[PDB]
């Protein structure tokens, strides 16, 4: 058993190499946690049919956390380096034309980090090129990609709340399960708790949202606003305290993501639905189709 309990045959061909356009034309398998095994073979654009006014749809929007770096040109001039994204390529700070700089140890001794170097290349592209191994201390498709401005508007029009929490990404988060740093806005925490108090559904869009909401839950309080971090491995058995429904991609065999879905939908029912998805020609992974568990 072990990892074999979450295994299934996934034809390599069904792992989407490109997304569908419009994005909400991707297929959507609707499966239920309770009652008899039953699914609806739809498209993401059909989501409104399965939601209702008052449902709270929670998404994650990645927020980049730049890195505060201190350098020094070989000549002697200081220069700040706000490493933003592209790994370690995009940044901006201070003057000094396109030249070369030496990475200086923050605390250590403010001395030149061995081998750590960089040189200003182009400008406003996708503005610097570093060398050596970066110092620790100092873009990726997800379930949300399936939504279009149109789908979002249709959801608003039917009274579905659209709430967004923040997943922190970028150089400013580096430290080295994969820890997940996040932030939940006050209005979001408040909206989720009021919905629960009123018996309204909290619908998670993606497992990142699931992990953040469940990690932010406090007994006697509900979900707390603010920053947080979670390295919790959600897997069977697990009782969800916040998430009432889940919109998520089709995950790879033996993946921890599949394990999280298994905890929400049930391991056996999850494997059954996945086998059906395979047999029905669904596309898998990041650019593939989606699943809605109600």
Curated annotation (Swiss-Prot):
It is an enzyme of class 2 (transferase). Pathway: tRNA modification; tRNA-queuosine biosynthesis. Keywords: Cytoplasm, Queuosine biosynthesis, S-adenosyl-L-methionine, Transferase. Its EC number is 2.4.99.17. It holds the Pfam family Queuosine_synth. GO terms for molecular function: S-adenosylmethionine:tRNA ribosyltransferase-isomerase activity. It comes from the Bacteria. It catalyses: 7-aminomethyl-7-carbaguanosine(34) in tRNA + S-adenosyl-L-methionine = epoxyqueuosine(34) in tRNA + adenine + L-methionine + 2 H(+). One of its GO terms (cellular component) is cytoplasm. GO terms for biological process: queuosine biosynthetic process; tRNA wobble guanine modification. It is found in: Cytoplasm. Belongs to the QueA family. Monomer. NCBIfam families: PRK00147.1, queA. Transfers and isomerizes the ribose moiety from AdoMet to the 7-aminomethyl group of 7-deazaguanine (preQ1-tRNA) to give epoxyqueuosine (oQ-tRNA). This is S-adenosylmethionine:tRNA ribosyltransferase-isomerase. It comes from Thermus thermophilus (strain ATCC BAA-163 / DSM 7039 / HB27). The lineage of its organism: Bacteria, Thermotogati, Deinococcota, Deinococci, Thermales.
